[PDB]
Structure formats: structure tokens, C-alpha cells
């Protein structure tokens, strides 16, 4: 059977795109987002001339900062910039282009070395970014060594334990699919074929009784991967229809606010995936997006990990973000937090002067010990909620 997720109401799709639209005018390097560009080009929606300026800003920022600036794009972000080039039917080229390719290849080589031949060692970033990097290079027809593919081939088998991420498995699966379709790494062809099936099975086993693969926010990338190949023996069609039901309910309940999440979902709603960047169709018609023309809440903020420990009740207007609660806590006094830019949005580097170290992140949780599925800007707490910030080791 095939994974077919049928078209959602054009109105519903349009309002998703309108969430992306304001970002088209935010061209500062801290806000530039190659995933937004890609998601829009693969969608049934367009922003017209704004897109061209956006791509121009991407090429200015990424090439100047990496090869020559407020900040620098990470290597993972460079990979998504490569996807953005494919979305405009471009191959990375010229002397600058060649250098960018080798920088991404160095990223993969360093992660390979960090992982080790024992395979005990962890990557400095994630297996998600490792897969994303292989995919990005493959989309531009740039080859990577079998030894590099093998790390990912291992990371995908159920009991491996490098990660337990439906997103990472889907991205891998996407990387493996590009290798297979391009006939790259022929000395790993059978293992690559088997790994794709492995990822299929593990994703179909992460399905929630509601219908989602892992989490509402894992479902988009999971669907992208599942759409790329048949799955004989399995009931892929049924699983995917159940996922649309779950997806539809989530959409109608305002689950998708975050621009990156929308950018990963929009291709699915247009029957496209990142694998369509092998043979892009840049001139396919797309609908022009036009701009879419009081209660008081108390949220408890608790940071047990820090000594002295922090528990406080913060009063904010309803619909306020966790970041909004954090900002009020700084004004009232006794709270300091630090944030770093991400394509997803603000990321919490520090709470109360403690900044997470290697393999440490500040988890956002709502009692009792339930990890939040959304970021500090995206999540809006219900009244009487306790929001906790815990330093945890990944």
C-alpha cells in the first residue's frame, strides 16, 4: 500500500501559509530561515517576488559569513540552505559553492570521527543533523563515503539507542532514499535498502492511538518519509489515513503556530517531500499568499535544579507565551535566563546564571514531569499550570 495524505481544505492550507508570510520580510541573519523558503517552494502557496529577495538574502548571508557578520550559520543550517538552492532548481556551483560543499563534507567527517569506530562515541550535534547533511549533499549529487553512510545505517536499527527520535529516523530515511534513488554508495546498496524498510517499520510502530507518529510535530517529517516509497506487506494506506485524521484535528485546534513546523508540513499537504528536490518542478503553479487582514493568568515558574531553588507565581495576560512569563519573572526580580537563535525560534541556553554544558539541555516541562512538545515562544500555559525548567542530560 501507499502513503496517501489527501488535500486539506484550501482555506485551512491558506491560513497555515499566512503564518509563514510575515517571515518573508524578516531578512536579518538571525531570522533568515532556509527551511521556510524550502517549505514554501514545495507547497501549493507562494509569496511572489518576496521569495526572490529571500533567496538573495540567504545567498548573501550564508556565503559571506561561512567563506569570508552577526553570527555564522551552523553546518546543519548550511545543509538546509543547500535544500533551498534545489528548491530554486539550482545546483551549488562556482568556487564559493565548491567550498561550501567541502565545509559540509568536513562537518560529516568530524561527526564520523566523533562517533568513532567503536560506535560508542556520540556526535557533537545529533544524528538528525548527520542525516540532514548526507541528504543535502546527495540532493546536489555529491557523494559521501560508505563509511559515512554506515553510521546512519546503524543509528536506524530499533535497538541502537543513539536516539529514539521519529524525526531523526524520518530524516535518515530521507537521506537513505536519496542515496538509493541516486544509485550512490553502491557498496552499501542492500543495507541502504534494508535500512529504509527498518525506518518504515519503526515509524509505523511509533503511531499513537490518536494517529500521530510519535508526536503531532513528528508527523509531518514522518509523512514526508513514508510518502517516498511503497511498503509491501504493511497497511501503509490505513496508517497514513489515520494520521491525516489526527493531523486534521490538530490543525483545527491550532497546533501549528511555529514557522519551522509549518514549513515541514506544507510540502506534505501538497503531496511533496524533500525527495522532490532531486527533480524539482519550480514552475508548477502556486496560489499567491496575501496578508491575512483581557483575562489575567497566574503561572508558577519552578527551577528545582538550581540552588537556591526557585518557585514563584507569575501573573500574565491569557494567551501569553512561556517566554512572556520568563520576561515578567526577570522584571519582578530574582530571575535571569539566556536565549540563542534557532530556525525553530528562541532556545534556552541559561537559567539563573547556569548555562547548559555539553550533552545538557534545559528541558521545559509541565507538572507532573510531562515534557513540553512546544518551545518557550510557541507554548501558551493554561491557568494554574506549573512550568518547570530542568537541566537534563541528553
Amino acid at each position: 500500500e501507499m502513503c496517501e495524505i489527501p488535500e486539506m481544505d484550501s482555506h485551512l492550507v491558506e491560513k497555515l501559509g499566512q503564518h509563514l508570510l510575515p517571515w518573508m520580510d524578516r531578512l536579518s541573519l538571525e531570522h533568515l530561515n532556509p527551511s521556510i523558503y524550502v517549505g514554501l517552494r514545495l507547497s501549493s502557496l507562494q509569496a511572489g517576488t518576496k521569495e526572490d529577495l529571500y533567496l538573495h538574502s540567504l545567498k548573501l548571508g550564508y556565503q559571506q559569513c561561512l567563506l569570508g557578520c552577526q553570527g555564522k550559520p551552523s553546518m546543519g543550517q548550511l545543509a538546509l540552505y543547500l535544500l533551498a538552492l534545489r528548491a530554486n532548481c539550482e545546483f551549488v556551483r562556482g568556487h564559493k559553492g565548491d567550498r561550501l560543499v567541502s565545509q559540509l563534507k568536513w562537518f560529516l567527517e568530524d561527526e564520523k570521527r566523533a562517533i568513532g569506530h567503536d560506535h560508542k562515541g556520540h556526535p557533537h550535534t545529533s544524528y538528525y543533523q548527520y542525516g540532514l547533511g548526507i541528504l543535502a549533499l546527495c540532493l546536489h549529487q555529491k557523494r559521501v563515503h560508505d563509511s559515512v553512510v554506515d553510521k546512519l545505517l546503524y543509528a536506524v536499527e530499533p535497538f541502537h539507542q543513539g536516539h529514539h527520535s521519529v524525526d531523526t529516523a524520518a530524516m535518515a530515511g530521507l537521506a537513505f532514499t536519496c542515496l538509493k534513488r541516486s544509485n550512490f554508495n553502491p557498496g552499501r546498496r542492500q543495507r541502504i535498502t534494508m535500512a529504509i524498510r527498518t525506518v518504515q517499520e519503526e515509524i509505523l510502530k511509533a503511531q499513537t492511538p490518536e494517529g500521530h507518529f510519535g508526536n503531532v510535530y513528528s508527523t509531518p517529517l514522518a509523512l514526508q518519509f513514508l510518502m517516498t516509497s511503497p511498503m509491501r506487506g504493511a497497511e501503509l494506506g490505513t496508517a497514513c489515513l489515520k494520521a491525516r485524521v489526527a493531523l486534521l484535528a490538530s490543525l483545527q485546534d491550532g497546533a501549528f503556530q511555529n514557522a519551522l513546523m509549518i514549513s515541514q508540513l506544507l510540502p506534505v499537504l501538497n503531496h511533496k517531500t524533500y525527495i522532490d528536490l532531486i527533480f524539482p518542478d519550480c514552475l508548477a503553479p502556486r496560489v499567491m499568499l496575501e496578508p491575512a487582514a483581557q483575562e489575567i493568568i497566574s503561572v508558577t515558574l519552578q527551577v528545582l535544579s538550581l540552588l537556591p531553588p526557585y518557585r514563584q507565581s507569575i501573573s500574565v495576560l491569557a494567551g501569553s507565551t512561556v517566554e512572556d512569563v520568563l520576561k515578567k519573572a526577570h522584571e519582578l526580580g530574582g530571575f535571569t535566563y539566556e536565549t540563542q537563535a534557532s530556525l525553530s525560534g528562541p532556545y534556552l541556553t541559561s537559567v539563573m546564571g547556569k548555562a547548559a554544558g555539553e550533552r545538557e539541555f534545559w528541558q521545559l516541562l509541565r507538572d507532573p514531569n510531562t515534557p513540553l512538545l512546544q518551545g518557550i515562544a510557541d507554548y501558551r500555559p493554561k491557568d494554574g499550570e506549573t512550568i518547570e525548567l530542568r537541566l537534563v542530560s541528553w
Partner: nanobody
Amino acid sequence: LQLVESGGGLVQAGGSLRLSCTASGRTGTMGWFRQGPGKEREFVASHKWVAGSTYYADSVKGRFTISRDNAKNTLYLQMNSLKSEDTAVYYCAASSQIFYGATTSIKDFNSWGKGTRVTVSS
């Protein structure tokens, strides 16, 4: 979430101990872990929500049979063909998150039972 184990006492090798764990509420992944006395804890088997979302540690494969009643929030381990090493305390465990296969390690499970000890006789 509360997990309450049942069954499991004093069997001769070769075996047939059934085991049970019931939970107050619906959970994502439910699994079983055995602790040898004095030796940390070991993963035994998972079972997520759908169909054969069954994961087994290589020690128990072929005895095995983790099963799950989603209606009644209750998992089970058939544990046929028992041996010396199977003597241990068996703990039920649960987590509200369904992940990408094989959680295996502790720490990935938030809710634990008190355990049923199982003992096999030579």
C-alpha cells in the same frame, strides 16, 4: 500513573510463569525490566500501542510473548521455558511517550511498579 504487578512465584525450570501489570491510565510505551539481586536492572521487553510493537531483549527471545490489552491498560509476559538467570525481580514500567523503538534503558520510563520476584529451582 500507578502500575500494580501480579502473579510470579517459585517455579521449577521449564517454566510457564504468566505475570501481569495493570495501570491507572492509558500510557504510551509499557515494558518489563528484571533486576538480578545485587546487579542494577536489565531491560526485558517493551510493547507500544499498535499490534506487534513488541520489543525483546535477546535473552528472552523464544520464551517472550509480551502482550497488551489497550482496553484495560494491562500488559502481560508469558515467560515459558524459565532458567537460572530468569530468577530476578520483575518490574513493570510505563512512559506517556511513544518513541523510535527499543527505549531499553531505564531513565526513559517515568512510572514503575513495586515488582514481582520470580525464582526458578534447579
